[PDB]
Design a protein around this nucleic acid. Structure first.
Ligand SMILES: [Mg+2]
Ligand SMILES: [Mg+2]
Ligand SMILES: [Mg+2]
Ligand SMILES: [Mg+2]
Ligand SMILES: [Mg+2]
Ligand SMILES: [Mg+2]
Ligand SMILES: [Mg+2]
Ligand SMILES: [Mg+2]
Ligand SMILES: [Mg+2]
Ligand SMILES: [Mg+2]
Ligand SMILES: [Mg+2]
Ligand SMILES: [Mg+2]
Ligand SMILES: [Mg+2]
Ligand SMILES: [Mg+2]
Ligand SMILES: [Mg+2]
Ligand SMILES: [Mg+2]
Ligand SMILES: [Mg+2]
Ligand SMILES: [Mg+2]
Ligand SMILES: [Mg+2]
Ligand SMILES: [Mg+2]
Ligand SMILES: [Mg+2]
Ligand SMILES: [Mg+2]
Ligand SMILES: [Zn+2]
Ligand SMILES: [Zn+2]
Lengths: 25, 130, 129, 102, 81, 64, 225
RNA sequence: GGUGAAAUUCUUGGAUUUAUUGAAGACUAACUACUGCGAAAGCAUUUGCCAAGGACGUUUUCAUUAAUCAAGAACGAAAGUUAGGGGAUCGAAGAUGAUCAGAUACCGUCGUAGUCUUAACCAUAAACUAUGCCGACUAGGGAUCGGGUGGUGUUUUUCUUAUGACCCACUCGGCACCUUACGAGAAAUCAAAGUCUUUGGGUUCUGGGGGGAGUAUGGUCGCAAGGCUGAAACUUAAAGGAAUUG
RNA sequence: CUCUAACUAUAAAAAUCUCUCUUCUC
């Protein structure tokens, strides 16, 4: 693994969860 | 691919060192010599030693060289390095009697408090690139 | 002058398909546009010296037919953004022009060079062949 | 580990340097770590200097030369034989390799 | 090194070294008495003078501004005082 | 056309080619002896031989 | 070398049979007045050859136009204006350096000084002049380099600017070329800037035309004869 | 055209290469260096204006006004985001023809958003000298840049006194370099990473095995991307540094 | 103890891999 891409995956998860929260409100 | 290995080289070199007065430039004569005067078990090794010794004979007669230093060459160097010329070539005599110096060396001589006949001259201190 | 008919060879030598394109002193009227690819079959040895040599020989024949004897060569590379470096064919074309009867004079390096213009092709890490 | 004291860059006090593009591989690279060779060359080789000479008016021409300053990358330079991987104790010798033609 | 008289160094050492480094620091500058070519009025001038020191008698410059010691008027006469 | 040319090698320039069988040779033409050219030749060669060329314009470089 | 897609989105004629030759004569200031020959299509009214010729440019080394080899590195552009018949008259267009000398004298360990200026000449010609200078090792150097301080470049650059301003605004392009042939202006610059720094090998680069008044037929007639 | 090769794509409506030009936008080669400046990011055409700054010089002035910095603040590469001005090259996403078993990757031809700007944000980079700042000292040698000193120095000629540019010698300050250990460390190596078990000059900030993870949540700033602050449950006996030999 | 000159030019494709790791005092 290369920490760049792990951070990219984590930020993708962050974006997905933030969009879910925005749709929830 | 024949390179005349260490043993033959050292044996022939020692033969040179100890026997050069009694050696010639002819392969057959040195072959008979080295067979009679140095115990060699095998004929092939004897012949190789004789060949290398003859090659070194031709080399030495061509001129004294590295490594080989026997009695005659050492005596020649002894009588040749004891060479002493005539008057010392400094002697205040050669190169326009009363030799040239520089002003700073002149004042060294003056500060020493000795005579040391002198001839002052500047330097034109320009530093050439060269 | 010795009653000579001057011309300009002005070779353009990229790393592929060396060009030989002679014109008059005014530079506008073209003679013998035949190039390296004209005289080779592979379409990939165009940069090879053979293509340039045959092109130069045919140019020389055309020049002898039209009267231009002495030449003023202007060697050019692609230059500009691309590598600033002369191609291999153009020099052989120049030599072939030299052999075949014609005369030379004032060979020039007319490589177009920029003063850092043109953010150019390749990307950050560049070619990755 | 510290491979080279000068970091193999030769910047050491500039912060940032303007990038330059490689001649062959077109890689952007800091201009100091952009190994550079002054390709100063005669416009034709000796195999054609004669050929041009007898086919030349203006006898004894100056035969003008072509100059260029190749700014390689490092990958092309090591691949295209310009720079050679030398031994550890020989890295610290920065003089050109002993008078190419003597 | 390793054995010195820092208290009695050679005068050459005093001269060569930068000031503020001597045992006691004394400014390398000095004061000079200078005669203007026009009027005989003598004037006292600091070696590294800053402003153009015209004589009070007449508008004749005696020193010119410079990073180091001021440059004179090429005709006036200076003596170290 | 029969522009066959003859050239005597004066120096053997080692041996070139990945195969290790082709020789670079510096041949001076028998006609116009003042001119010399280097060319590639396949087969055994020694200096002093005289060799045949269909083309004499082509300069031969190393065969990679 | 055979065929191609030929995405068209015999009737051949000879190129040279319908073509004809013309001669070029240089301004009388130049030494070797005969320049060479140029190829034209055959003269047919309604687009006569005269319309095509006037405006062309001929690109010739200065050593050719003088005879000696000391002018090898220079290279003059001439503009085709008047057609006499079997011979055409050309006015001065521009003058330049060959790239080889320029690249040769731009070496390391000596910074260059460039001086650009845009000046009207004596009569009406708007021109642009470049000046290239290089620092010189004094013949006692032990420091291996001859960099100049930006103040020195400022002074030398300005001085060259007024030097060119005077030498162009005072005399016309013909007299300008008269000064240009024996490069008196170069040694003038070297002398005028000698007190700043040695400044090896100053030269005038890319004498570039910008604008011309109307035609001045009489000027051309006086130029050639 | 382009390449290891191959087409993709433009071509007698004459493509490509020619000569003049013109257009817009971009950058500022070659000089360009173990070289300059700045707090850092960074900064390279000319000229004017605007203020600013270090170093040097200073027998000028105040006399502790200082250093580091929690809280607070200003700058802060690229990429990103708003709108408006641009619109050339180049080019993420896409469109294409090759490579391969497959290739929406590497080679190649178009190509939006972006690169360029004006206001508004964002504040992160391998922002690296992976070395915090201010101090003092310790070892020799060269050069380099800025400044100032002496040269009865040389080139310069405006007869010549003045400049300038060099040569020498000295000094102050900066990027650095070479030899070396007599010190240091684990070693690479360092003239600072020394003056440290002979442990003490003043100071801020960081870390306590590795994964979990710079993740969950709570704040906090931002329109947005996300930035700062920031654990545990659990799991593991190693992960890691340096050099040595294959 | 006076010395500042010569140069060339390649990047086709190439993926994967099972046990079994242990012993130095006289
Ligand atoms: Mg590779
Ligand atoms: Mg490594
Ligand atoms: Mg390097
Ligand atoms: Mg066309
Ligand atoms: Mg500078
Ligand atoms: Mg700085
Ligand atoms: Mg520049
Ligand atoms: Mg804080
Ligand atoms: Mg941006
Ligand atoms: Mg926009
Ligand atoms: Mg594909
Ligand atoms: Mg793609
Ligand atoms: Mg691959
Ligand atoms: Mg691509
Ligand atoms: Mg494109
Ligand atoms: Mg950070
Ligand atoms: Mg850090
Ligand atoms: Mg820091
Ligand atoms: Mg932990
Ligand atoms: Mg983690
Ligand atoms: Mg948050
Ligand atoms: Mg390791
Ligand atoms: Zn490269
Ligand atoms: Zn007075």
């Amino acid at each position: 693994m290369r920490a760049k891409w792990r951070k990219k995956r984590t930020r993708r998860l962050k974006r997905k969860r933030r969009k879910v929260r925005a749709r929830s409100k | 691919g024949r390179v005349r290995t260490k043993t033959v080289k050292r044996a022939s070199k020692a033969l040179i060192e100890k026997y050069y007065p009694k050696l010639t430039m002819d392969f057959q004569t040195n072959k008979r010599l080295c067979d009679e005067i140095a115990t060699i078990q095998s004929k092939r090794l004897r012949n190789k030693i004789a060949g290398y010794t003859t090659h070194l004979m031709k080399r030495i007669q061509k001129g004294p060289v590295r490594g080989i230093s026997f009695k005659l060459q050492e005596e020649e160097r002894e009588r040749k390095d004891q060479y002493v010329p005539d008057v010392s070539a400094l002697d205040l005599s050669h190169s326009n009697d009363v030799l040239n110096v520089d002003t700073q060396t002149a004042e060294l001589v003056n500060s020493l408090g000795l005579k040391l006949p002198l001839s002052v001259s500047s330097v034109s201190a320009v530093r050439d690139r060269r | 002058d010795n009653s000579q008919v001057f011309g300009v060879a002005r070779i353009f030598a990229s790393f592929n398909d060396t060009f030989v394109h002679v014109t008059d002193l005014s530079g506008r009227e073209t003679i013998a546009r035949v190039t390296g690819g004209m005289k080779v079959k592979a379409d990939r040895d165009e940069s090879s010296p053979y293509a340039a040599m045959l092109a130069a020989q045919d140019v020389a024949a055309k020049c002898k037919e039209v009267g231009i004897t002495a030449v003023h060569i202007k060697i050019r590379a692609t230059g500009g953004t691309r590598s600033k470096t002369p191609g291999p064919g153009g020099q052989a074309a120049l030599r072939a022009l030299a052999r075949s009867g014609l005369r030379i004079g004032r060979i020039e390096d007319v490589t177009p060079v920029p003063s850092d213009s043109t953010r150019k092709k390749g990307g950050r890490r560049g070619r990755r062949l | 580990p510290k491979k080279r004291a000068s970091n193999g860059r030769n910047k050491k006090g500039r912060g940032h340097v303007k990038p330059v593009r490689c001649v062959n591989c077109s890689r952007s690279v800091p201009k100091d770590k952009a190994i550079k060779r002054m390709a100063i060359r005669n416009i034709v080789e000796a195999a054609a200097i004669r050929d041009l000479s007898e086919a030349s008016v203006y006898a004894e021409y100056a035969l003008p030369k072509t100059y260029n300053k190749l700014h390689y990358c490092i990958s092309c330079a090591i691949h295209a034989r310009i720079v050679r991987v030398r031994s550890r104790t020989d890295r610290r010798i920065r003089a050109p390799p002993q008078r190419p033609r003597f | 090194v390793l054995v010195q008289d820092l208290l009695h160094p050679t005068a050459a050492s005093e001269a060569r070294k930068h000031k503020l480094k001597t045992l006691v620091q004394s400014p390398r500058s000095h004061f000079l008495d200078v005669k203007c070519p026009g009027c005989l009025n003598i004037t006292t001038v600091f070696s590294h003078a800053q402003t153009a020191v015209t004589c009070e008698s007449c508008s004749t410059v005696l020193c010119t501004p410079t990073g180091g010691k001021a440059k004179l008027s090429e005709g006036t006469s200076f003596r170290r005082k | 056309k029969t522009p066959v040319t003859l050239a005597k090698v004066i120096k053997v320039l080692g041996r070139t080619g990945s195969r290790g069988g082709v020789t670079q040779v510096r041949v001076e033409f028998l006609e116009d002896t003042t001119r010399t050219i280097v060319r590639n030749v396949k087969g055994p060669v020694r200096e002093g031989d005289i060799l045949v060329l269909m083309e004499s314009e082509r300069e031969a470089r190393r065969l990679r | 070398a055979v065929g191609k897609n030929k995405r068209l989105s015999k009737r051949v004629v000879d190129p040279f049979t319908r073509k004809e030759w013309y001669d070029i004569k240089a301004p009388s200031t130049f030494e070797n007045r005969n320049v060479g020959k140029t190829l034209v299509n055959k003269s047919v009214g309604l687009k006569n050859a005269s319309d095509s010729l006037k405006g062309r440019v001929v690109e010739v080394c200065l050593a050719d136009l003088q005879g000696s080899e000391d002018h090898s590195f220079r290279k003059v552009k001439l503009r085709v204006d008047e057609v006499q018949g079997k011979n055409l008259l050309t006015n001065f267009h521009g003058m330049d350096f060959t790239t080889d000398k320029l690249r040769s004298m731009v070496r390391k360990w000596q910074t260059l000084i460039e001086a650009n200026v845009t000046v009207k000449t004596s009569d009406d010609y708007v021109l642009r002049i470049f000046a290239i200078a290089f620092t010189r090792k004094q013949a006692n150097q032990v420091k291996r380099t001859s960099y100049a301080q930006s103040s020195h470049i400022r002074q030398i650059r300005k001085v060259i600017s007024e030097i060119l301003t005077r030498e162009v605004q005072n005399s016309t392009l013909a007299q300008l070329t008269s000064k240009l042939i024996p490069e008196v202006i170069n040694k003038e610059i070297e002398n005028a800037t000698k007190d700043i720094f040695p400044l090896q090998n100053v030269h005038i680069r890319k004498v570039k035309l910008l604008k011309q008044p109307k035609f001045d037929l009489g000027s051309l007639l006086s130029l050639h004869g």
